[PDB]
Amino acid sequence: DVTNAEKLVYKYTNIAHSANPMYEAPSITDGKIFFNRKFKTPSGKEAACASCHTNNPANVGKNIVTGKEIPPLAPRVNTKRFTDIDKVEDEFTKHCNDILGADCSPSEKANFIAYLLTETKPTK
Ligand code: HEC
């Protein structure tokens, strides 16, 4: 595990750098607000990455669609996550297109992947 996680980082980082020579590496201090910033959707409705994945992804989320239960999202915390890359290399763009209404920035992904592959301490 991680092999992919690390790849993504080294991936989304390259792409970004390929777009903005300024961006070279990610951080673990940006993957918070962006995931805790009550943003508005193009479908007239506010939401947040912490609306389902809670303020903390490593924690137990909850879908506001069915209201079942979304176990820890932390793809790193869980050994049964972030396995495939091909697929994952889309489900992330399709998501932002169904969350924000478009494809998230390449520098916003490597960021999340970082914080996701960084924080591994849940509350309870
Ligand atoms: C509820 C309406 C959600 C909000 C708000 C956001 N996401 Fe989400 N996410 C949601 C679901 C139903 C799923 C599928 C898995 C599950 O059990 O819920 C996901 C999955 C992700 C993933 C993993 C993708 C994969 O590895 O296949 C990521 C990385 C992810 N979500 C990130 C993410 C971000 C960045 C969000 C704000 C821009 C966000 N989610 C909001 C449901 C919901």
Side-chain angles (χ1 to χ4, degrees):
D1 329 311
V2 198
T3 290
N4 330 146
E6 165 56 39
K7 195 93 131 105
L8 291 201
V9 177
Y10 209 90
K11 189 78 120 191
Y12 290 94
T13 289
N14 242 46
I15 281 136
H17 178 76
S18 182
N20 244 130
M22 303 250 233
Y23 196 88
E24 301 240 69
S27 181
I28 63 151
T29 290
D30 259 314
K32 255 290 113 137
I33 297 154
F34 167 63
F35 175 75
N36 293 353
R37 197 127 83 83
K38 172 108 66 57
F39 54 79
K40 218 212 119 192
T41 69
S43 97
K45 157 159 123 101
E46 68 270 291
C49 306
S51 67
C52 301
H53 307 300
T54 56
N55 56 83
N56 213 38
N59 209 339
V60 169
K62 157 248 285 212
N63 285 350
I64 80 179
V65 170
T66 62
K68 278 229 274 237
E69 78 185 56
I70 313 268
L73 163 87
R76 203 217 208 165
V77 167
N78 320 358
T79 48
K80 251 260 94 112
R81 290 273 199 273
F82 263 22
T83 309
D84 191 12
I85 293 107
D86 168 51
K87 258 82 207 82
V88 126
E89 200 146 272
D90 200 22
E91 282 264 284
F92 238 133
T93 270
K94 305 262 109 145
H95 193 8
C96 273
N97 250 293
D98 251 316
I99 302 287
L100 290 178
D103 200 337
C104 286
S105 320
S107 245
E108 302 266 278
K109 196 96 70 201
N111 196 107
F112 187 62
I113 278 128
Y115 230 101
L116 264 188
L117 80 93
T118 286
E119 302 235 290
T120 71
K121 304 163 120 167
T123 292
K124 284 197 161 196

Coordinates of all heavy atoms in Angstrom, one line a residue, residues 48-49 51-53 63 70 73 82 88 92 95 99 112, ligand 1:
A48 N -20.2 20.8 1.8 CA -18.8 20.8 2.3 C -18.3 19.3 2.2 O -19.0 18.4 2.3 CB -18.7 21.4 3.7
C49 N -16.9 19.2 2.0 CA -16.3 17.9 2.0 C -16.4 17.3 3.3 O -16.2 16.1 3.5 CB -14.8 18.0 1.6 SG -14.6 18.9 0.0
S51 N -19.3 17.5 4.9 CA -20.8 17.3 5.0 C -21.1 15.8 5.0 O -22.1 15.4 5.6 CB -21.5 18.0 3.8 OG -21.2 17.4 2.6
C52 N -20.3 15.1 4.4 CA -20.5 13.6 4.3 C -19.3 12.9 5.0 O -19.4 12.0 5.8 CB -20.7 13.1 2.9 SG -22.1 14.0 2.1
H53 N -18.1 13.4 4.6 CA -16.8 12.9 5.2 C -16.5 13.6 6.5 O -15.4 13.5 7.0 CB -15.7 13.0 4.1 CG -16.0 12.5 2.7 ND1 -16.3 11.2 2.5 CD2 -16.1 13.1 1.5 CE1 -16.5 11.0 1.2 NE2 -16.4 12.1 0.5
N63 N -23.6 9.5 4.5 CA -24.2 10.0 3.3 C -25.5 10.7 3.6 O -26.3 10.1 4.3 CB -24.4 8.9 2.3 CG -23.1 8.4 1.6 OD1 -22.1 9.1 1.8 ND2 -23.2 7.3 0.9
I70 N -20.9 5.7 6.2 CA -19.7 5.7 5.4 C -18.4 5.6 6.3 O -17.9 6.6 6.8 CB -19.7 6.9 4.4 CG1 -21.0 7.1 3.7 CG2 -18.5 6.8 3.4 CD1 -21.0 6.3 2.4
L73 N -12.9 7.3 5.6 CA -12.6 7.5 4.2 C -11.0 7.4 4.0 O -10.6 7.0 2.9 CB -13.2 8.8 3.7 CG -12.6 9.4 2.4 CD1 -13.3 8.8 1.1 CD2 -12.6 10.9 2.4
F82 N -7.8 2.9 -1.6 CA -6.7 3.4 -2.6 C -5.9 2.2 -3.1 O -4.7 2.2 -2.9 CB -5.8 4.4 -1.8 CG -6.2 5.8 -2.0 CD1 -7.4 6.2 -2.4 CD2 -5.2 6.8 -1.8 CE1 -7.8 7.6 -2.6 CE2 -5.6 8.2 -1.9 CZ -6.8 8.5 -2.3
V88 N -9.5 5.0 -9.9 CA -9.3 6.1 -9.1 C -9.0 7.4 -9.9 O -9.3 8.5 -9.5 CB -8.3 5.8 -8.0 CG1 -7.2 6.9 -8.0 CG2 -8.9 5.7 -6.6
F92 N -12.3 10.6 -9.1 CA -12.0 11.8 -8.4 C -12.4 13.0 -9.1 O -12.8 14.0 -8.5 CB -10.5 11.8 -8.2 CG -10.0 11.9 -6.8 CD1 -9.0 11.0 -6.3 CD2 -10.6 12.8 -5.9 CE1 -8.6 11.1 -5.0 CE2 -10.1 12.8 -4.5 CZ -9.1 12.0 -4.1
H95 N -16.4 13.0 -9.3 CA -16.9 13.4 -8.0 C -17.0 14.9 -7.9 O -18.1 15.5 -7.7 CB -16.0 12.8 -6.9 CG -16.5 12.8 -5.5 ND1 -17.8 13.2 -5.2 CD2 -15.9 12.5 -4.3 CE1 -18.0 13.1 -3.9 NE2 -16.9 12.7 -3.3
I99 N -19.9 17.3 -7.2 CA -19.8 18.0 -5.9 C -19.7 19.5 -6.1 O -20.4 20.3 -5.4 CB -18.7 17.3 -5.1 CG1 -18.9 15.8 -4.9 CG2 -18.5 18.0 -3.7 CD1 -20.1 15.5 -3.9
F112 N -5.2 17.1 -1.1 CA -6.0 16.2 -0.4 C -5.4 14.8 -0.1 O -5.4 14.3 1.0 CB -7.3 16.0 -1.2 CG -8.4 15.2 -0.4 CD1 -8.9 15.7 0.7 CD2 -8.8 14.0 -0.9 CE1 -10.0 15.0 1.4 CE2 -9.9 13.3 -0.2 CZ -10.4 13.8 0.9
Ligands
HEC1 C1 -21.8 13.5 0.4 C2 -22.9 14.3 -0.4 C3 -20.4 13.8 -0.1 C4 -19.8 15.0 -0.1 C5 -20.2 16.3 0.4 C6 -18.5 14.8 -0.7 N1 -18.3 13.4 -1.0 FE1 -16.6 12.4 -1.4 N2 -17.6 10.7 -1.4 C7 -19.0 10.5 -1.3 C8 -19.3 9.1 -1.5 C9 -20.7 8.6 -1.4 C10 -18.2 8.5 -1.8 C11 -18.0 7.0 -2.2 C12 -17.5 6.2 -1.0 C13 -18.4 6.3 0.2 O1 -18.5 5.3 0.9 O2 -19.0 7.3 0.4 C14 -17.1 9.4 -1.8 C15 -15.8 9.1 -2.1 C16 -14.8 10.1 -2.1 C17 -13.4 9.8 -2.3 C18 -12.9 8.4 -2.7 C19 -12.9 8.0 -4.2 C20 -12.3 6.7 -4.4 O3 -11.3 6.4 -3.8 O4 -12.9 5.9 -5.2 C21 -12.7 10.9 -2.2 C22 -11.2 11.1 -2.4 C23 -13.6 12.0 -1.9 N3 -14.9 11.4 -1.8 C24 -13.3 13.3 -1.7 C25 -14.2 14.3 -1.5 C26 -13.9 15.7 -1.7 C27 -12.6 16.3 -2.0 C28 -15.1 16.4 -1.4 C29 -15.3 17.9 -1.4 C30 -14.8 18.6 -2.7 C31 -16.1 15.4 -1.2 N4 -15.6 14.2 -1.2 C32 -17.4 15.8 -0.9 C33 -19.9 11.5 -0.9 C34 -19.6 12.8 -0.7

